[PDB]
């Protein structure tokens, strides 16, 4: 928690020769397992309310490793383990009908294992079907 989940974490802070030196280091010629998940939310009236009042309050309180970055047309979210959004909580916030399917209208991308279960959307580091 939580600097390691920043968009410009680690090697991304470096420029010029310093960046190239780490980019081409021997130990960085293989992938490194990450416990993170990345969630991309398309900016919209509904999403922006969800970001401010769910992700950045209850979400970050539950998972303090959450990082949210403003990427002009979308919100970029990275966290350890899992991110969850309850559409039923979002519907209460928005005051209008809002099933888990309506939530997905502006869920633009996922790096990780994503699923819906009831009113909840989850993206998780877990490898379901392989993990126990």
Partner 1 sequence: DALKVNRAPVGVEPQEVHKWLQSFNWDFKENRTKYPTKYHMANETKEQFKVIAKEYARMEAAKDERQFGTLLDGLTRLGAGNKVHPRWGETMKVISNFLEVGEYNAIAASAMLWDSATAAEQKNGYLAQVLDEIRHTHQCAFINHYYSKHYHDPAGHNDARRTRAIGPLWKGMKRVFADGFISGDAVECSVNLQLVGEACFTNPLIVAVTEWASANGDEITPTVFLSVETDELRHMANGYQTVVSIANDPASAKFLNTDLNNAFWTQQKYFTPVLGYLFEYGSKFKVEPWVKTWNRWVYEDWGGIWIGRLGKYGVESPASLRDAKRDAYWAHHDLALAAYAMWPLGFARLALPDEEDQAWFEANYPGWADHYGKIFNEWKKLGYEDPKSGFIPYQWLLANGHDVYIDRVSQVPFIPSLAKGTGSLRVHEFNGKKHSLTDDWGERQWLIEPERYECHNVFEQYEGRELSEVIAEGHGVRSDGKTLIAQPHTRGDNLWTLEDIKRAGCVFPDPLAKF
Partner 2 sequence: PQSSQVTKRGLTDPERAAIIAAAVPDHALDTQRKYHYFIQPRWKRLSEYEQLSCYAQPNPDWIAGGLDWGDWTQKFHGGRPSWGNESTELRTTDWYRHRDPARRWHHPYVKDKSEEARYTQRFLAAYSSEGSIRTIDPYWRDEILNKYFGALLYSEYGLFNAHSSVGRDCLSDTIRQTAVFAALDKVDNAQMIQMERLFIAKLVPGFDASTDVPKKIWTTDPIYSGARATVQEIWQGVQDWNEILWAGHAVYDATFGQFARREFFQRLATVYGDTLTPFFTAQSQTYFQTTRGAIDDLFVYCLANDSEFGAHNRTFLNAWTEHYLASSVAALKDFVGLYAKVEKVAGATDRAGVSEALQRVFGDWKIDYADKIGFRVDVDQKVDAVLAGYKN
Binding site for partner 1 (CB under 8 A): 7, 11-12, 15-17, 19-20, 23-24, 28-34, 36-38, 40, 42-46, 48-49, 71-74, 101-102, 104-116, 125, 127-130
Q: How many Å apart are CA 85 and CA 55, to the nearest integer?
A: 8
CB of 45 to partner 2, least distance (A): 11
Query: Which is nearest to 123 in space by CA: 69, 55, 74?
Result: 55
Q: Is the peptide bond before 2 cis (omega within 30 degrees of 0)?
A: yes
What minimum distance in Å lies between the beta carbon of 58 and partner 1?
Answer: 20
Dihedral of the CA atoms 101, 102, 103, 109 (nearest 10)?
70
**48 is an interface residue for partner 2 by CB under 8 A:** no
Contact positions toward partner 2, by CB under 8 A?
Answer: 3, 6-9, 12-13, 67-72, 92-96
């Amino acid at each position: 928690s939580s600097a390691h989940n920043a968009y410009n974490a680690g090697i991304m802070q470096k420029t010029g020769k310093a960046f190239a030196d780490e980019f081409f280091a021997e130990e960085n010629q293989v992938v490194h397992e990450s416990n993170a998940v990345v969630l991309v939310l398309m900016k919209s009236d509904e999403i922006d309310a969800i970001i401010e009042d769910i992700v950045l309050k209850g979400g970050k309180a539950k998972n303090p490793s959450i990082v949210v970055e403003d990427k002009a047309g979308f919100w970029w979210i990275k966290a350890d383990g899992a991110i969850e959004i309850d559409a039923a909580e979002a519907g209460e916030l928005l005051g209008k009908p809002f099933s888990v399917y309506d939530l997905l209208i502006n869920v633009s991308s996922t790096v990780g294992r994503a699923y819906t279960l009831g009113t909840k959307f989850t993206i998780t580091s877990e490898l379901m079907g392989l993990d126990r």
